[PDB]
Ligand binder design. Structure first.
Ligand SMILES: Nc1ncnc2c1ncn2[C@@H]1O[C@H](CSCC[C@H](N)C(=O)O)[C@@H](O)[C@H]1O
Ligand SMILES: Nc1ncnc2c1ncn2[C@@H]1O[C@H](CSCC[C@H](N)C(=O)O)[C@@H](O)[C@H]1O
Ligand SMILES: [Zn+2]
Ligand SMILES: [Zn+2]
Ligand SMILES: [Zn+2]
Ligand SMILES: [Zn+2]
Lengths: 851, 851
């Protein structure tokens, strides 16, 4: 009576080493450790998982198979992957890791990831020599493989007997090295009757091991699940080899965790009615899940729902067939790797959104207060706030979602909007909810963006953050002007040009930020003020949110709430981000100039005379040293003390990304190397003698994004018109890139000339979409780059594309160009063949073939 | 009438490129930038000079040629070398740098070196377009060379005319590109009559440029000094090529400078009498120099003196001739590069000693207080403090300076000692002074170390910091036991082993440290207490110091004073350092364990119940996790939270070396890689089967130090007995190093067998000097490593050196062994030849030649 597991073991040991290497990863899920391993190689202590074990445990935790809580004990913690992961979980209060260490054994790696202060990893600790301790969660990942099943068998029994006394009425997750040996099966069955639980297989396990995990939250037949794994693994012997499914690795954050500072206290007076209506609308599946993971967001309930998302995006075929040598390159195809599944959403939420910012110091709040009041006055020197209207909102919708064009057309939609507006006037809010992913819910949602648009839309529609009105702003300028603005800034004497990224800007917006942004209502007419005051107080400073969550029993929709942070899916996000960033960068300039000291930040009663004088005499000039677009900023300070000015910036919550909190910033003096709005900008001399300033970025980012379809049902003609749109865009904005202009030419010749580009190449505020036309590209290029280009005085047109410059050939290569490679040369010769292939797929329309 | 400068220029332009490269550095002084350039390459912002310009300016500043003060303006600041250097000078309050920048021009580099907060470097600033500003110091280093002298001429005149209006009654240092053209000479002469000053040549200038500097503090004949430079440079054309004189680069420290927190306020009641006596003793040259450089030490006066020191140490010839292939290696000969000249002393003082530590927080002082009181009680549990005596002090002197053996023999010395002791009993101090480098001054000095020895010598003499008495200490253990103690520590379960170096420990000793170390007097007998109280209060907490300083008019001896810091040239330095370090590492362990929080450090009234309980229940066990020898420490905490525990350590002033202040520490789990007392320790298996634990270090450090003579008058027989001493030491402690045992064999065969080793191989407290004997080395080796080695149970002797193990051959190589190189092989064959050479120099004594 030989078991299937033993059959598998017999086949595995007979494998040559090469077939073994191919088999062990065939069709498995594998996390991408490339970034983390290089981070650890440089001694980084934040964000990185210390091993592949963090992701492995995460797979269990995601599915509520084990929910770490209270005192967590991690037997055989090794480098500490499981321990560091548990440190950030809601109900975990202490993590104790024991591991052997010494020669041939992994050692604990010290880290500063989130919750490090409740992690206690001890080496020199053989767990088979340890008396069991009281704990609320028991973890164990011990088990050393052997070519002999019976050797593994005794190792597995040893583990099980060691670990059994640690368990009683607590959570656990225990590795079972060899689960298919009859004596192990028999032992596990008796264990299951005392402590409950079930055996589960982790998809991240390699096929070279039959390992399964005894977890506490589940029931089921041990014998059955084991043989299901055995068959799965035997099947994968003969099954045609398939590459592993690559997932993104975990981000464990940074800093000390204070469990009691995490929970949210909601304003139930304000958000209560909204919950009640969601509850009424979904009463048939409404429930309260105590096992919700939310630490810093208040939880209010859930209802059941059909799942939504995809493990990776759709591919545009027309452009992928015209860019054959980019199938091979990593970062291109590793941009289609996207997860909007309920699992990926929860991962992003935990790692990025489920955080809390400490309140800024009293002196810091004073400075922000003074600066905000000054900034709003400056911004409203010429303009006044105004209400937007139904007709306005309707026009904008029509000129671009098709369900939205139907909704604004329905009078019943506007009756709902009116009803909710009357609530707002009374200080009440009934259906104002946003999401993180009947038609009554669709109407409730679109109706809410309208009421926001009505109250705060003036910031966008009336260009409050144009350069002329805000000095620092770049709204309405366009990607083809941004480079020129940075070049102009570089001419101002002083320090280097700095461009520090904030780590998750929207989550870093504080209660004090929100109350400073609110001050613009003091410039409003009374009836406008009451509507805006409703938006700020009821929906901005008290957000009610829908988010999907995977459960053992299907997907659910959680209703949660938060007082601070920025609702990212909202009208006014860009303008308010730009305003707060302007303010923040002014404050940092004050610090670098010595106007604002450490003593001032801590001083509970800061004197305002000093700040007011600096603003009234230097404020505007310092605004002109900056280019600010939402969370993205470029600052050129009067000197480089700015680099070391980190006190105010951190205390305001605007912690920089990918750099230690107190390490000085590093800038540029060549403006052409400064990153801004996902681009850098090159100065090019036309052979006509004149000069252009062009936007540029890593080419693979441009290639890969173009290879992504829109619409969950590509209809060839639709997906080709999108390919033409990227081609037109490339010829208008990235004409200087040799590979792109050649591929732009190829797409436009492989697509019918009369077909109009559809969909959107991008949703960037800086994109004016001049490329979505039937008009000749050289005539469009002339209009953009010569005619209405204010930094081009000689208005002489260009008659030939050969007077339109490329980048320097080394610079082209440096930014990702494949020019030089053999494959690129081959690809170039093969172009009219690939043209014919696309044209054959489309069919029989009018083509004009292009160089 | 062609000038000599023009003659030089004519010869320089006719040089081929290779002869040009040889000439331009022939016999010049050149700073070593290797460390700094790699530091900057990794983006380090502390300590490093940003260019070779910092050292260049330093040469001028050293000699009072220009003394930067008040507002300093740096024209053509470039990367900012001059500006960052000035930022740390006593009377400088603000540094403004202007430089052009842009293509082809140097750009300002942001740094966090000491005084960065008063440095304002602006780029995009052409100084020939700038209106002159008011300043107290004008710096300018502009001047672009040309093969044409007349091109340079107009460039130099342009500079001089630009810079002249910046000057009036202020300090300046101005580069004169081409000083030898007649029109420049004529212009400089008229400039000198209005603004004074003189032309000076910087030795760090290359021979490829005739550049000189117009400095404000000096007079002299311009024509003369210029032609003296011209002749010097012509001479260097034909002069046989000489390698540049390599100096150590500058260290500009780190952190913000607060000018008003720097000055020292002396206790004149206490130190007044001491100054008065130095003043009386040296009245004929006593003066008060207002141009003294001291920022954080109080200055009291100066007297004139003959210079003392040497630009590099003496070389031992016997061992250098037996180690021929190490003439070539850098770090060996770059260990003889030593500067005890008055110039080097001042550099070390400014960079390392002339600093100030901020007062620790009130909560931090409470913890240190509690821990110190507990530590002293533990240390005195078995022993009592006791007075040491004349007879004791005399015995110690005799058993090792020859002037000291004469002094303790003279009854008149002890009459002076008695006289001073009676002052101490009354709370007065008359002649208690130490130094930084008649016989009445020699007697005053030796008499002072006695009174210290008398009061605090018990700490050393009675082994208060032996491991048995202090748990953490290693006093009296020896370098051959240290490795075994670290191995024993590694067996204690918990975190990694940490060994963080403090940056200049002795300068980091605070007023609170001194007052905690003082508490041991509470365990003394009354008559002992009054003597010790005198030492602590009068000479430890109020130090009067002699230090040499170079001036335009010769060397002087400055009298300065300081309240805190540790007098490094003092009895009890090691014991008090060990005590304070033990205390500090206990405090850091409390923080890592969460017993001590940020709130506690800041809490002005910390509750002691928590600290006292941790000490009384865990104190000793935590002491046993450590090995502490003075400022050097090894800690193995209960887990690795210790790595991130930096709050208390920094606030106590014990800032770590070569690592950002708030970056987590990184440790070891292999105890054999842990650095301790300038060594690491390897475990070796004898072929007898038993194991040894041996001390090891980079071999070039052992080679180079052995190649250094003692005594400023090597008498061959004296310097050879020193070579034998290093040979004996190597065979006892570094027998495992293949190159060293072979070179040990060679020295002992090239030196007469009956000659006894003299002088000292080292002054380390861990050196028991068992190697200074005539006795057979294998018998000495047996006694040390088998007989009285407590970690060697099998006491079976070793009869042959071939049962004495070497390191693993890869490990030998890794630690600097030249085994494998061709030169090492050649060196090995050439040994009996080199033996014969040494023996030929010595003469005709009895040799025994050795393998
Ligand atoms: N007897 C024993 N006592 C304690 N630890 C042991 C042990 N036998 C093996 N181990 C350790 O258990 C570890 C299993 S690998 C565990 C990795 C960990 N879960 C992570 O995510 O990082 C190995 O590093 C091994 O050193
Ligand atoms: N016209 C001008 N205006 C301002 N700076 C100029 C200038 N012409 C040259 N310079 C700058 O002057 C510098 C001289 S090298 C100065 C180095 C500096 N003393 C240090 O220690 O680091 C060059 O970097 C050059 O860029
Ligand atoms: Zn509402
Ligand atoms: Zn580019
Ligand atoms: Zn005295
Ligand atoms: Zn070694």
């Amino acid at each position: 009576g030989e078991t299937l597991g033993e059959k598998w073991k017999k086949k595995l040991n007979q494998l040559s080493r090469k077939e073994f290497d191919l088999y062990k990863k065939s069709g498995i899920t594998e996390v991408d450790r490339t970034e983390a391993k290089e981070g650890l190689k440089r001694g980084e202590t934040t964000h990185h998982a210390v091993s592949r074990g963090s992701a492995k445990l995460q797979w269990f935790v995601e599915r509520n198979m084990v929910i770490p809580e209270g005192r967590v004990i991690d037997l055989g913690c090794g480098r500490g992957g499981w321990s560091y992961y548990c440190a950030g979980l809601k109900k975990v209060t202490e993590v104790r890791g024991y591991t052997k260490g010494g020669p041939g054994h992994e050692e604990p790696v010290p880290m500063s990831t989130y919750g490090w202060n409740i992690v206690k990893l001890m080496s020199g600790k053989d767990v088979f020599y340890l008396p069991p301790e009281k704990c609320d969660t028991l973890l164990c990942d011990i088990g050393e493989s052997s070519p002999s099943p019976t050797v593994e068998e005794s190792r597995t029994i040893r583990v099980l007997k060691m670990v059994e006394p640690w368990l009683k009425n607590n959570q656990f997750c225990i590795k079972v090295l060899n689960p298919y040996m009859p004596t192990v099966i028999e032992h596990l069955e008796r264990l299951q009757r005392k402590h409950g639980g079930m055996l589960v297989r982790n998809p991240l396990s390699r096929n070279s091991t039959h390992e399964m995990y005894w977890i506490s939250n589940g029931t089921g037949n041990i014998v059955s699940s084991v043989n299901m794994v055995s068959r799965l693994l035997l099947n994968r012997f003969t099954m045609t080899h398939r590459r592993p499914t690559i997932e993104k690795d975990v981000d464990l954050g940074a800093g000390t965790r204070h469990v009691n500072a995490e929970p949210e206290t909601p304003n139930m007076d304000v958000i209560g009615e909204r919950i009640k209506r969601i509850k009424e609308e979904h009463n048939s599946t409404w429930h309260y899940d105590d096992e919700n993971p939310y630490k810093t967001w208040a939880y209010h309930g859930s209802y059941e729902v059909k799942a939504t998302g995809s493990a990776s995006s759709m591919i545009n075929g027309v452009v992928k067939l015209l860019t054959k040598p980019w199938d091979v390159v990593p970062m291109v195809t590793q941009m289609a790797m996207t997860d909007t599944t309920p699992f990926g959403q929860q991962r992003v939420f935990k790692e990025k959104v489920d955080t809390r910012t400490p309140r800024p110091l009293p002196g810091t709040r004073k400075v922000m207060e003074i600066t905000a009041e000054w900034l709003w006055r400056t911004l409203g020197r010429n303009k006044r706030p105004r209400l937007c209207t139904r007709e306005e909102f309707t026009k904008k919708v029509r000129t671009n979602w098709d369900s939205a064009k139907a909704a604004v057309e329905d009078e019943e939609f506007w009756k709902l909007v009116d009803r909710e507006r009357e609530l707002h006037k009374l200080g009440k809010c009934g259906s104002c909810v946003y999401n993180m992913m009947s038609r009554a819910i669709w109407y409730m949602w679109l109706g809410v963006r309208y009421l926001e648009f009505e109250a705060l839309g003036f910031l966008n529609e009336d260009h409050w953050f144009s350069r002329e009105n805000s000095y620092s702003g770049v709204e309405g300028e366009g990607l083809h002007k941004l480079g020129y603005i940075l070049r102009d800034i570089s001419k101002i004497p002083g320090g280097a040009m700095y461009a520090d990224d904030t780590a998750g800007w929207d989550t870093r917006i504080t209660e004090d930020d929100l109350h400073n942004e609110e001050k613009i209502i003091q410039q409003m007419d009374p009836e406008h003020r009451q509507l805006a005051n409703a938006i700020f107080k009821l929906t901005y400073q008290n957000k009610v949110v829908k988010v999907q969550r995977p459960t053992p029993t299907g997907t659910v929709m959680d209703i949660i709430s938060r007082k601070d942070q920025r609702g990212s899916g909202q009208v006014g996000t860009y303008g308010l981000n730009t305003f707060t960033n302007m303010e923040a960068q002014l404050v940092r300039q004050m610090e670098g100039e010595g106007v604002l000291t450490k003593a001032d930040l801590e001083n509970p009663h800061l004197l305002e005379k000093k700040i007011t004088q600096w603003l009234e005499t230097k404020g505007v000039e310092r605004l002109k040293r900056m280019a600010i677009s939402g969370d993205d900023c470029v600052v050129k300070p009067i000197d480089d003390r700015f680099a070391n000015a980190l006190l105010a910036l951190n205390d305001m919550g605007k912690v920089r990304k990918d750099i230690p909190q107190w390490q000085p910033s590093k800038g540029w003096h060549d403006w052409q190397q400064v990153p801004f709005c996902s681009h850098h900008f090159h100065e090019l001399i036309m052979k006509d003698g004149r000069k252009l300033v062009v936007p540029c970025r890593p080419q693979d980012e441009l290639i890969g994004r173009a290879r992504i379809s829109q619409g969950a049902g590509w209809s060839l003609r639709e997906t080709a018109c999108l390919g033409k749109a990227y081609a037109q865009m490339w010829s208008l904005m990235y004409f200087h890139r040799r590979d792109l202009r050649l591929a732009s030419n190829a797409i436009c010749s492989a697509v019918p000339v009369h077909w109009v580009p559809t969909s959107r190449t991008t949703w960037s505020i800086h994109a004016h979409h001049q490329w979505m036309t039937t008009e000749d590209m050289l005539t469009v290029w002339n209009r953009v780059w010569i005619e209405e280009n204010p930094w081009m005085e000689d208005k002489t047109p260009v008659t030939t594309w050969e007077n339109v410059p490329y980048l320097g050939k080394r610079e082209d290569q440096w930014c990702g160009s494949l020019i030089g490679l053999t494959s690129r040369a081959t690809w170039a010769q093969n172009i009219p063949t690939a043209i014919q292939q696309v044209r054959s797929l489309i069919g029989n329309e009018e083509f004009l073939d292009y160089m």
